[PDB]
Design an enzyme around this catalytic site. Structure first.
Site, PDB file in Angstrom:
ATOM      1  CG  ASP A  75      -8.180   7.515 -23.069  1.00  0.00           C
ATOM      2  OD1 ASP A  75      -9.258   7.215 -22.515  1.00  0.00           O
ATOM      3  OD2 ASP A  75      -7.119   6.936 -22.784  1.00  0.00           O
TER       4      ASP A  75
ATOM      5  NE  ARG B  93     -16.946   3.761 -24.246  1.00  0.00           N
ATOM      6  CZ  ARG B  93     -16.816   2.556 -24.805  1.00  0.00           C
ATOM      7  NH1 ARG B  93     -17.714   2.089 -25.673  1.00  0.00           N
ATOM      8  NH2 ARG B  93     -15.778   1.797 -24.477  1.00  0.00           N
TER       9      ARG B  93
HETATM   10  C1  LIG Z   1     -10.368  18.218 -21.430  1.00  0.00           C
HETATM   11  C2  LIG Z   1      -9.562  17.002 -21.904  1.00  0.00           C
HETATM   12  C3  LIG Z   1      -8.483  16.557 -21.154  1.00  0.00           C
HETATM   13  C4  LIG Z   1      -7.742  15.466 -21.535  1.00  0.00           C
HETATM   14  C5  LIG Z   1      -8.057  14.772 -22.694  1.00  0.00           C
HETATM   15  N1  LIG Z   1      -7.257  13.737 -23.053  1.00  0.00           N
HETATM   16  C6  LIG Z   1      -7.403  12.944 -24.131  1.00  0.00           C
HETATM   17  O1  LIG Z   1      -8.380  12.921 -24.887  1.00  0.00           O
HETATM   18  C7  LIG Z   1      -6.254  11.956 -24.391  1.00  0.00           C
HETATM   19  C8  LIG Z   1      -6.102  11.472 -25.672  1.00  0.00           C
HETATM   20  C9  LIG Z   1      -5.086  10.578 -25.975  1.00  0.00           C
HETATM   21  C10 LIG Z   1      -4.210  10.132 -25.017  1.00  0.00           C
HETATM   22  C11 LIG Z   1      -3.107   9.100 -25.417  1.00  0.00           C
HETATM   23  N2  LIG Z   1      -3.005   8.007 -24.427  1.00  0.00           N
HETATM   24  C12 LIG Z   1      -1.945   7.108 -24.814  1.00  0.00           C
HETATM   25  C13 LIG Z   1      -1.857   6.051 -23.677  1.00  0.00           C
HETATM   26  N3  LIG Z   1      -3.140   5.282 -23.577  1.00  0.00           N
HETATM   27  C14 LIG Z   1      -2.789   4.439 -22.438  1.00  0.00           C
HETATM   28  C15 LIG Z   1      -4.158   6.319 -23.270  1.00  0.00           C
HETATM   29  C16 LIG Z   1      -4.268   7.365 -24.388  1.00  0.00           C
HETATM   30  C17 LIG Z   1      -4.356  10.619 -23.722  1.00  0.00           C
HETATM   31  C18 LIG Z   1      -5.371  11.527 -23.408  1.00  0.00           C
HETATM   32  C19 LIG Z   1      -9.135  15.236 -23.451  1.00  0.00           C
HETATM   33  C20 LIG Z   1      -9.905  16.324 -23.059  1.00  0.00           C
HETATM   34  N4  LIG Z   1     -10.906  16.753 -23.853  1.00  0.00           N
HETATM   35  C21 LIG Z   1     -12.191  16.490 -23.652  1.00  0.00           C
HETATM   36  N5  LIG Z   1     -12.562  15.642 -22.690  1.00  0.00           N
HETATM   37  C22 LIG Z   1     -13.839  15.381 -22.489  1.00  0.00           C
HETATM   38  C23 LIG Z   1     -14.832  15.978 -23.263  1.00  0.00           C
HETATM   39  C24 LIG Z   1     -14.436  16.877 -24.252  1.00  0.00           C
HETATM   40  C25 LIG Z   1     -15.383  17.518 -25.057  1.00  0.00           C
HETATM   41  C26 LIG Z   1     -16.750  17.202 -24.975  1.00  0.00           C
HETATM   42  C27 LIG Z   1     -17.640  17.883 -25.805  1.00  0.00           C
HETATM   43  C28 LIG Z   1     -17.149  18.858 -26.684  1.00  0.00           C
HETATM   44  N6  LIG Z   1     -15.857  19.135 -26.741  1.00  0.00           N
HETATM   45  C29 LIG Z   1     -14.983  18.503 -25.962  1.00  0.00           C
HETATM   46  N7  LIG Z   1     -13.114  17.119 -24.407  1.00  0.00           N
END
Ligand SMILES: Cc1ccc(NC(=O)c2ccc(CN3CCN(C)CC3)cc2)cc1Nc1nccc(-c2cccnc2)n1
Ligand SMILES: Cc1ccc(NC(=O)c2ccc(CN3CCN(C)CC3)cc2)cc1Nc1nccc(-c2cccnc2)n1
Length: 271
Positions: A159, A145
């Protein structure tokens, strides 16, 4: 000098909020405050996470923006920019046209998502996690998910930060959580490996809910006695072997993600 003259202020992730035409909420709430937008200068559809003027989560939002600026990998969702000057704050990423991996697996045509595609998808996720391991990061909430699917079977680890059904309970997703994390609140790259095992089972079963036939309150006790989910229908013995290695009771006995990525590579050589 010239740099400081031309860049007086902020970093080169910072963007003006009016660069993005916000369109509609993505996922009807399931990703939280995440919207589809168009980055106008590039006519590019993007995903935008926002935080309104009045919440308690400013610090976590700002730390997430900070963390994302430090990581870059073909199988981690790509930061495109941030708005962090004034609320509402934005984090802007690429938009992934096939949405989240769990829903994709459940809804996909299995003539197209053959065994080789499942392997490719698993390998890519293990590569993202090898990079995180190598850079001393922990995911803490790895699951289908939380992965996204792009064109050409590209999968990326994300995430969505959505602790807050019975996926998350007082807030942990019990079925993806290593024993040590359930019992002691200890999280490490090794507890991510456990979760990856459950993720691999999701991949192998095309998005089945884990521990079928089992009550949630009984899971920890069962794992402790040595119960592990059974080999899914059609699951190659090598894939199941790796699943089972991810679910070793003691975190030190679980493979690294480097080893896991090596195992998937070996499965493409062998067959
Ligand atoms: C808009 C956005 C803002 C922030 C993030 N962030 C992350 O995805 C992410 C990934 C890895 C980490 C690394 N981190 C290291 C530390 N541990 C504690 C947490 C993870 C942090 C954030 C994603 C998104 N993207 C996102 N979010 C929700 C939905 C979608 C989405 C849905 C459908 C189609 N396309 C995109 N896209
Ligand atoms: C990593 C993985 C995990 C699970 C599976 N599962 C399956 O391949 C599979 C097979 C049969 C079914 C049952 N299905 C029920 C309904 N009827 C219509 C069709 C059969 C379900 C899944 C594949 C893989 N992929 C995999 N694993 C190892 C090697 C390879 C591989 C593939 C191609 C070339 N080289 C290597 N591919």
């Amino acid at each position: 000098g010239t740099e400081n003259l031309y860049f007086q202020s902020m970093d080169k992730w910072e963007m003006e909020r009016t660069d993005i035409t916000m369109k509609h909420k993505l996922g009807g709430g399931q990703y939280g405050e995440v919207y589809v937008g168009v980055w106008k200068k590039y006519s590019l559809t993007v995903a935008v996470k926002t935080l309104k003027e009045d919440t308690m989560e400013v610090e976590e939002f700002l730390k997430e923006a900070a963390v994302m600026k430090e990581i870059k990998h073909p199988n981690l969702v790509q930061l495109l920019g941030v708005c962090t000057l004034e609320p509402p704050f934005y984090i802007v990423t690429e938009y992934m046209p096939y949405g989240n991996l769990l829903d994709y697996l459940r809804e996909c045509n299995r003539e197209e998502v053959t065994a080789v595609v499942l392997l490719y998808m698993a390998t890519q996720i293990s590569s993202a996690m090898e990079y995180l391991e190598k850079k001393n990061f922990i995911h803490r909430d790895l699951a289908a998910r939380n992965c996204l699917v792009g064109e050409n079977h590209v999968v990326k680890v994300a995430d969505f930060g959505l602790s807050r059904g019975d996926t998350y309970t007082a807030k942990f997703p019990i079925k993806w959580t290593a024993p040590e994390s359930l019992a002691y609140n200890t999280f490490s790259i090794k507890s991510d490996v456990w979760a990856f095992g459950v993720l691999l089972w999701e991949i192998a079963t095309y998005g089945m809910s884990p521990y079928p036939g089992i009550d949630l309150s009984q899971v920890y006790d069962l794992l402790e006695k040595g119960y592990r989910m059974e080999q899914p229908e059609g699951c190659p013995p090598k894939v199941y072997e790796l699943m089972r290695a991810c679910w070793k009771w003691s975190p030190a006995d679980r493979p690294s993600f480097a080893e896991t990525h090596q195992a998937f590579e070996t499965m493409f050589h062998d067959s």
